[PDB]
């Protein structure tokens, strides 16, 4: 998991957020993100 040091919200944070993993959940239960489509 990548981390940017700087943050407008402050201290230090990993870049990935709740919306991305929500989209991953939606694509899994679709039955258009992939692992590669997160990588790009």
């Amino acid at each position: 998991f990548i981390v940017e040091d700087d943050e407008s919200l402050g201290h230090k944070e990993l870049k990935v957020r709740k919306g991305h993993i929500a989209k991953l959940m939606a694509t899994e239960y679709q039955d258009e993100y992939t692992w590669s489509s997160l990588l790009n």
């Binding site: 929500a22 959940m25 939606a26 239960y29």
Partner: peptide
Amino acid sequence: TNASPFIKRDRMRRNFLRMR
């Protein structure tokens, strides 16, 4: 505390259906 011994998934899928 809740301490999360167990977790739910589709209830949250539904919560994001209302959120989006």
